[PDB]
Amino acid sequence: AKKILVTCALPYANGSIHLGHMLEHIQADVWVRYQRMRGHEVNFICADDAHGTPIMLKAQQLGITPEQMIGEMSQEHQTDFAGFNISYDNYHSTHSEENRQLSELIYSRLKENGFIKNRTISQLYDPEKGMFLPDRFVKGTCPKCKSPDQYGDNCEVCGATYSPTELIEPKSVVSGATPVMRDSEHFFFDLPSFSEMLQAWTRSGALQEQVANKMQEWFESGLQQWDISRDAPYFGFEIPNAPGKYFYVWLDAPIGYMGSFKNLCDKRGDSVSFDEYWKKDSTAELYHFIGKDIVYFHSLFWPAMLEGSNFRKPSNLFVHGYVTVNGAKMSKSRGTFIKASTWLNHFDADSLRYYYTAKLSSRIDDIDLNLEDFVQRVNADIVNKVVNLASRNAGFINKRFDGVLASELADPQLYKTFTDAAEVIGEAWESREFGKAVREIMALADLANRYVDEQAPWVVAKQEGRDADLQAICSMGINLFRVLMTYLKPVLPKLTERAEAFLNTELTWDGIQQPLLGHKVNPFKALYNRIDMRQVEALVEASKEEV
Ligand SMILES: CSCC[C@H](N)C(=O)NS(=O)(=O)OC[C@H]1O[C@@H](N2C=NC3=C(N)NC=NC32)[C@H](O)[C@@H]1O
Ligand SMILES: [Zn+2]
């Protein structure tokens, strides 16, 4: 019995969920469902990251309050995640009372502990709109090639990089007014003070090898103080005792993990679990599933923030690579930039969950969704290997034996081979070696289908006096199916439900030790149908048209 708190990165509230995000939530959900199957106390937590200048400016363009826009995006996001059956125990928001109080608390403790410094800096300022401008909101003519209408610190024409201050005839993307340098006091988090603490953390062998290596690069470059304040106008949390100053979104974002859990506890009327999970001497486990582009925040700023505020640190960080479609970054022009909602119009959630899982590993490598291979893998593995085991045998049981399975296993040894694999497959799920688990499961499926081929029930069915043998053979195939679906339960939630309805039994990890004997099963409509390239073409075409 373990206590585990698992999170996925908090998606920004200024964009729709796409297949890239889904890889992250699907990987976490499979791990979480497996942990639940092994009987642990699990708390799967997430929320929308709703602060920041971009969000503030978007709402303004749309002519609505940031609170209205984020509210709409929060519902959109949760609807999509629900469509893919991501089993969160709570989905909250960084813009909440819980996060506000927790953000103020942590800040106050850090300051109290001498980890916050004051410093004045110079930055481009929009005198017309009356707001400091982040680089991406400063446009002008490239100093090098002189190309007009360039944004940020780089020219999309000659590719040169430079400070926005170097842009010729600068202009605010907000008002179009000419920007100017202006001073401002900022608050900094003294990350450098936790250097040794962080280095030991990196060196423990807990973090993924590739992540540890990455961190060594950052220590080499040298840690610096982190600017965690932003001036009004800004959509975020105001800094105590600092009128007109707000916490930079990345400061309150990870605290959102804590805010979402506190929210869950308070809603449950649970007054002891928050401290049991976050206090320094906690015996519970904390895990964050994140993409490799936000590792700096989670491996350096985050642990240091918790340490300096007297809270426990993450047990581990689980980093994943990026999703590519047909081998390349999603392309809007090619119709490979696919939204989660769009996907569900063409395929079911189980298909993508399975494809991603078959390709996932414990490393940070990229995951490629090759659409052609997708159709082939789904049809060959789900339809032809696993579901086939049920469909080719259920008919005889229902029509010839009134849905009743044999009183004994026809091949006890073969069944033992299947149950004997639970240890290694469970370890594969546990260690996040999803690709390994799937290969082992499909290897078993091949064995099961070979067994059925060897017995040839379609032949036995037409031989008089072989009734008892037919029931024995078909019952055996169905029990092998029972075991396989148990191993795949964390992966295919819906197919699993349809499987449990047919089998008249909930599938539990330990349950496979007791095969279904003299047991009534129910007839069933198609458990899973084949898909085809025409559907893929439709998906791509729709995606092209949507942008
Ligand atoms: C306290 S965590 C705050 C995270 C921040 N709001 C953020 O970052 N939001 S995000 O919406 O841009 O990204 C959410 C997660 O999606 C992941 N991905 C975004 N695009 C992706 C792919 N194309 N492929 C794989 N993961 C992707 C990111 O790495 C990130 O972990
Ligand atoms: Zn240029």
Curated annotation (Swiss-Prot):
Catalytic activity, per the record?
tRNA(Met) + L-methionine + ATP = L-methionyl-tRNA(Met) + AMP + diphosphate
TM segments?
none
Q: Where does Zn(2+) bind?
A: 142, 145, 155, 158
Q: Where is this motif: 'KMSKS' region?
A: 329-333
Q: Which GO terms describe its biological process?
A: methionyl-tRNA aminoacylation
Gene Ontology terms, MF aspect: ATP binding; methionine-tRNA ligase activity; protein homodimerization activity; tRNA binding; zinc ion binding
Top enzyme class: ligase
Motif segment ('HIGH' region):
11-21
How many cofactors are bound and how?
Answer: Binds 1 zinc ion per subunit.
Name the coenzymes or cofactors required: Zn(2+)
Its Enzyme Commission number(s) read 6.1.1.10
Question: What subcellular locations does the record give?
Answer: Cytoplasm
Q: How is the quaternary structure described?
A: Homodimer.
Q: What does this protein do?
A: Is required not only for elongation of protein synthesis but also for the initiation of all mRNA translation through initiator tRNA(fMet) aminoacylation.
Protein family according to the UniProt entry = Belongs to the class-I aminoacyl-tRNA synthetase family. MetG type 1 subfamily.
* Protein name listed in UniProt: Methionine--tRNA ligase
According to its UniProt entry, this protein's organism is Escherichia coli (strain K12)
* Gene name, Swiss-Prot/TrEMBL: metG
Interval of the full protein contained in this chain: 5 to 551 of 677
